[PDB]
Ligand binder design. Sequence first.
Ligand SMILES: *[C@@H]1O[C@H](CO)[C@@H](O[C@@H]2O[C@H](CO)[C@@H](O[C@@H]3O[C@H](CO)[C@@H](O)[C@H](O)[C@@H]3O)[C@H](O)[C@H]2NC(C)=O)[C@H](O)[C@H]1NC(C)=O
Ligand SMILES: *[C@@H]1O[C@H](CO)[C@@H](O[C@@H]2O[C@H](CO)[C@@H](O[C@@H]3O[C@H](CO)[C@@H](O)[C@H](O)[C@@H]3O)[C@H](O)[C@H]2NC(C)=O)[C@H](O)[C@H]1NC(C)=O
Ligand SMILES: *[C@@H]1O[C@H](CO)[C@@H](O[C@@H]2O[C@H](CO)[C@@H](O[C@@H]3O[C@H](CO)[C@@H](O)[C@H](O)[C@@H]3O)[C@H](O)[C@H]2NC(C)=O)[C@H](O)[C@H]1NC(C)=O
Ligand SMILES: *[C@@H]1O[C@H](CO)[C@@H](O[C@@H]2O[C@H](CO)[C@@H](O)[C@H](O)[C@H]2NC(C)=O)[C@H](O)[C@H]1NC(C)=O
Lengths: 672, 48, 528, 288
Amino acid sequence: LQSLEDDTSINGFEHIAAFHGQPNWCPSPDAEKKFACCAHGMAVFPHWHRLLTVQAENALRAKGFQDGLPYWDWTLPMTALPEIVAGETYVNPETNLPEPNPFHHGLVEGKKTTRSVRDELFEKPKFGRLTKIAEMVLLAFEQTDFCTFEVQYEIAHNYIHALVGGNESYSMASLRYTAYDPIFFLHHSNTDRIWAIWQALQHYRGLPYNSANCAIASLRKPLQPFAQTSTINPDHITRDHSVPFEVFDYERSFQYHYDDLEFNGFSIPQLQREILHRQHDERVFAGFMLHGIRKSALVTLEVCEPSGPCHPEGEFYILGDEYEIPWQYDRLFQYEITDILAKYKLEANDRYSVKYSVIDLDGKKISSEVFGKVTVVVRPGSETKKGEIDKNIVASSHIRRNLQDLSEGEVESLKSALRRMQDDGTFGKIASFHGFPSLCTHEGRKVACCVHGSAVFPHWHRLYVDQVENALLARGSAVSVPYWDWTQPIRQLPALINEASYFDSRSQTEESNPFFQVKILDTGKVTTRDPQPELFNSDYLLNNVLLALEQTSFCDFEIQFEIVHNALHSLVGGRGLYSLSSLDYSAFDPLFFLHHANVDRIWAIWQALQQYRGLPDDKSDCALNIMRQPLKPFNDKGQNEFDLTNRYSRPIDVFDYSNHFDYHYDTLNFNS
Amino acid sequence: EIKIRAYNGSYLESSVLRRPSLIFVPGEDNSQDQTGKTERRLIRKSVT
Amino acid sequence: SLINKQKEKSRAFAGFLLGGIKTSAHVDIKVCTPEDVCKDAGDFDVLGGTAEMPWSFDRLYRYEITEVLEKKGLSVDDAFTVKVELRALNGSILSSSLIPTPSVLYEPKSRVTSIQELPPNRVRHEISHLDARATMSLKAALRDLQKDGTKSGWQALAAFHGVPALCPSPEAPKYACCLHGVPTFPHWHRLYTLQVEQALLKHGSTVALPYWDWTLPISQLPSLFTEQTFYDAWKDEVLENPFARGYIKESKGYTVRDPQPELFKLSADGKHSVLFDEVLLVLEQTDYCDFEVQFEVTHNAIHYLVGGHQSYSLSSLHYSSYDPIFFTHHTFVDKIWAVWQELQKRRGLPYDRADCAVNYMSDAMQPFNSVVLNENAFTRTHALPKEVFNYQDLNFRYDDMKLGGLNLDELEEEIRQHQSKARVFAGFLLHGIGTSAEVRFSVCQENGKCTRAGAIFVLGGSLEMPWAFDRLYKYDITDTLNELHIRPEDVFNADAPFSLRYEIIAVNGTALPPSSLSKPTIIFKPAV
Amino acid sequence: RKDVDTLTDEEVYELRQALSRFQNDTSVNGYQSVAEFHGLPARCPRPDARVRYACCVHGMATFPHWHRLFVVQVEDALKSRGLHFGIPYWDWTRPGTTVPAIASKETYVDPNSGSSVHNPFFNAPVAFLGETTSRQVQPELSTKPEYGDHTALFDGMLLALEQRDFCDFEVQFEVVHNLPHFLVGGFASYSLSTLHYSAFDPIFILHHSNVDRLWAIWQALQIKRGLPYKAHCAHTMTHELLKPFGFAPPLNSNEKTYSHARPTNIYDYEHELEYAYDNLQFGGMTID
Ligand SMILES: *[C@@H]1O[C@H](CO)[C@@H](O[C@@H]2O[C@H](CO)[C@@H](O[C@@H]3O[C@H](CO)[C@@H](O)[C@H](O)[C@@H]3O)[C@H](O)[C@H]2NC(C)=O)[C@H](O)[C@H]1NC(C)=O
Ligand SMILES: *[C@@H]1O[C@H](CO)[C@@H](O[C@@H]2O[C@H](CO)[C@@H](O[C@@H]3O[C@H](CO)[C@@H](O)[C@H](O)[C@@H]3O)[C@H](O)[C@H]2NC(C)=O)[C@H](O)[C@H]1NC(C)=O
Ligand SMILES: *[C@@H]1O[C@H](CO)[C@@H](O[C@@H]2O[C@H](CO)[C@@H](O[C@@H]3O[C@H](CO)[C@@H](O)[C@H](O)[C@@H]3O)[C@H](O)[C@H]2NC(C)=O)[C@H](O)[C@H]1NC(C)=O
Ligand SMILES: *[C@@H]1O[C@H](CO)[C@@H](O[C@@H]2O[C@H](CO)[C@@H](O)[C@H](O)[C@H]2NC(C)=O)[C@H](O)[C@H]1NC(C)=O
């Protein structure tokens, strides 16, 4: 770069950069009025900047180089600007002397580039969530059309210019002196990488990428000045590839490509899953129309409540000067409000207004009525939208499987983990919820908070079983909790629970499997099973669950659900006072979990049937005076562990288990 | 006739629970029920 | 039918279990806020005595509760309490524990479609089906109001849409009250169209304003307007038809209609007008905002087709309300809007709400919001376009939702047919330029010798708000490319396929600079 | 899989949680029971007979195959607990290399609970002996190569790659592989300095992941040059069952390695070993 910038002729860095500004040969050099070919807001902007980067790389290759231009990753959070450009004078021991950096500033027509960094770049994002720039660029990927992609792409692109330039004319903040600072090349390379991510994801989706179908009329036009004869640009490959139908297949054309397509440590399928999970729920947008105002300036937004004050909602930035073609975006431009909506807990359809204020770089307030009536729109979630074709979603973390086919390794692992849980003894404390002791109070008397006989019954058991299995996986079991199927006729008791005792190779010794019995804490006794002689070779459970599943509404379903739930409980409890019969103690056995797992399974099955039938499924129609209040044991914080048990405790929240709890099943088949 | 079977080994009299009933539902074979057309005839009435 | 209509709205109900308490008492329900504010929603009585045989219902008992909650703002998905008070016959308070605590139930929408019955008036028949009785009744019942110079006069009525302006404030007239561009256009115009039926009925109407199917092949303007003067001898005075001209209490002039040659152009089969394909294209899409932006220019066309080149005609928004053809056409406009809902019902996508205009829906609705400008008490409380979608609540209907003398079945069949193959579209930007204009475009390939691709329409007066449409208005040129013998793949081909030459013609014959409007774009639509 | 120099906070946090979950387990698939595969007590070749040995193939024609199977087994065990991606690898070949600061500490604060917690990377407990591995430091790894030169490890790697057949490349590969073992082990009794307790320190998996990466770039370079990279001089050595990975369940709970105990289908790691690498970069200079 030292040699290239010292060069002055048609091979000069100065000329290759002055391409992007003055002097002007745009639209054609032979015109009484000349502008710049920095196509801002057009539909060929990515094409043009890709050509610029290719020309820059070809030009620099001729000065003893090997690879392409490294891309500065401003998406990933940082605390300081890159040290490759931070220095002004650095010491090279090859000559054993210091000399000035070629990145700190750039001398152009008797003046140098100037930098004025602002602290708002150096924000430290709170743990777990990305930064503002990251989410802005992220929301440009789900849109399956380059037509709508381009606007978010360019707005993210030009955010950095105001973010880092400052308020100096002799700087890259303004378009006039922005192609002369060296880091501009780096930034545009990174933006080209963002676009490459875009078409990679497009190919993953399967829709065509190398042939957009929105602006073919303009896309037919060759670009300038990248198409005039070599007398104006020394190289030839860009001039020959001027027509922009071919700057898509970069790897086939220009013989170069990136290596790390990952974005903040996200693989392509991983970020696809993440964006689908984000799209799952409903949200809100602010919508703008954009046109030049001849002065690049920031635009801030604030929502004013008619029944209250007005509050700011962040800001974005736009580019514009007096030496470019006027541009008009075809469609709306989106901005996010969801964070402030959550913060102010205002209803999704309340009365309010959104007001935009335009401020120049200096700080002067231009008239706040230069963009018409800014709109606000609402977008329903993927769950809310229906396609009547299955569900077609894949989750992560927990995957619950039918233990009848579970292999012995994880079986031994999980029984060992449960034994360790009994060892530490917190299992009794966590299971004390469902019955005795009195962890509950009512009518001025020690009682149990065992929710029973209401629409919130399946909710409470699903939450309880998931909390218990999370506490178990805290011991690092090989697999998550399994479910014992009973829809198929049972030949006998399941092997894992009826086998006398296990033999572990860790000690190469026998030991009794806990699944038989467990000592109830400080009671002087232990549990005991008692099978019933009519539990086998019957289709009664099958036909009963079918005639319970046939129903349509929810409240009716709840009652037959509870009936069949307590059915096999009483059947297997037997004469034993301390068994699966009496619910005061019946939750102390692992059979409780092995049963409630399929108890949840059938609810999920009914959910799938309702989804297929198109009737309302997530929303309920009973206990509406209660469905807002979360479950009593899980309302508190001391007893409940963390996370789901204290945030996603709303019965209204409970329905969206596949997303707000992240656990799928092995399959939704129901007895073949 | 209804009897109560308990885990203790005993019974309970049926009077503790309300006496149940029998319900029969026809099949869902129904296709059309609404009349093809009504009758548009005027009817006069006394003024009082 | 009344109870079927009642079932459409959702209901909130209090559910109870009842039994015999061998006595009689008065029961009162009490709905209470979390902060201990209680309201007496209702009451009834329970009957029994010492000699009765004990009983209890096998099911629920429902009591309607929506009134108090909707009056006090407590929505259905809120939290509250319900309490029961018992008063004995002998003046003794009774224990509430004797009854079980009640529950709350929610009966939802009933998305089924109901064929409502209404009296044989306020039923907008098709214009050609009108008989002599209906025609004479309408013309008399319209001239009667037209010859009225009072506050309810026709000029004062039509002053809303046109001029003199009374907006944004009646005290100081700045600009016209016509609402255009923004999505609430069909709402405003449909309610304005309805507004005249009240006046017509109260002045002696017999049927509502008919709709004219201009989509059918049109030889010329229908004979109802084409007529000039007829004699009936009842008043022994020849009556001139009020369906040709209109008095302006300000300008002392009159409008003058003017046909245009293109209005008589017929389709390929000849059973539909040239605007039929555009009508289907409007019906095709799903999102409501895209629908309305594609749908405005549709009715905007006829104003220019029939208004001619006159400052005082339908070609100008200032004085378009002073000609009954305005009402005649907006009737068919509302027809299109209504028939869109039946097509919506197929995929059941939400339509009553506007996901893309949540700020716009709840906007105060000018000018009917203020009682100063109009004194129709029925519409004095309808300043919300959200309560206008369910037009059955507005007490009218249509004879049939048929278009082009055809059923929605063949409509969806033709939509599928036109979706089967590929398509090429022209997308135009459009925004207010404070006049009315023609956009005539010609598709021309490399040769430079080409045909007339087509034209579109735009209107705007000089006393209206600035406005820009949200999205790109799309027009079909695939057939024209077919006569040009250029396959759609040629557009993608590395060969230079073609371009378009557009131009704009003003109403008075002048031509505005092409710079006043953006650059049109070419869109491609694949096969499905 | 990615190098440990491009991992942010949250991935480290999730990995630490997963490691602790693995560690406190005392199962057949426990961390100690899988470190058993590479050290004492001895159960090789046939645990039923009298002879005692360690199945860790050292200095023979199957070292890369065996250790790659080991690392993929560890990956399969770990990814169940919630590992989003592959195991990170530490690039000791980096000029001016240092101990990974991700592991060099001892305790760290969980921000979610805002509280201190013991870092699993610091040390692990030997189960039967009841002791723990203690690392040791030496300045040899942390020496600074001068301006424009190359470090000893780097030139060792080059002098390992210039050869053009697998049948001898492995000997220098192994002899340079053993160096960072002692370099990180030092003179401490329990460390990677000896194979007696080699697997009881997490850095082991990082080091051998780097090993597998170098073997992969060896294949890439060889296929670029157009030479047979298959270990054809071990035709009677590959076909041996790589015990204990070829035994019967439940001794080998995982099934993928058991089915792939034949090394003849392990060269194409992009397909039948369900893992891949982000970049083939070596010292800022690619295979081309
Ligand atoms: C005024 O009217 C009320 C309602 O009819 C009368 O309340 C009734 O009072 C009698 C005795 O005060 C209750 O009899 C009770 O019967 C139970 C068995 O069911 C028995 O165990 C008690 O010892 C007692 O005898 C009766 O239940 C109650 N009515 C109801 C519906 O509960 C009241 O007595 C009337 N006033 C006068 C002065 O009679
Ligand atoms: C025929 O219609 C055209 C428009 O469709 C009329 O042109 C409009 O009015 C004037 C020309 O009469 C022009 O703009 C005006 O320019 C004056 C110059 O001082 C300015 O003061 C006004 O404020 C206004 O901007 C222009 O051609 C056009 N106005 C626009 C586009 O805003 C034309 O006048 C009509 N013909 C006749 C005979 O009136
Ligand atoms: C693997 O198992 C070990 C048990 O040997 C876990 O260590 C212990 O984990 C529990 C969390 O379940 C820690 O309890 C917490 O301690 C903090 C600090 O006192 C306290 O503020 C919390 O309220 C909670 O009680 C416990 O302290 C910890 N053991 C020690 C010695 O600190 C380890 O977390 C497990 N690894 C996992 C689950 O990944
Ligand atoms: C049947 O089971 C019930 C449940 O405990 C027993 O009933 C209780 O018995 C005790 C003492 O026998 C009494 O004090 C309670 O009042 C009884 N309650 C009820 C609801 O019955 C009963 O004892 C068992 N049957 C037999 C024969 O022992």
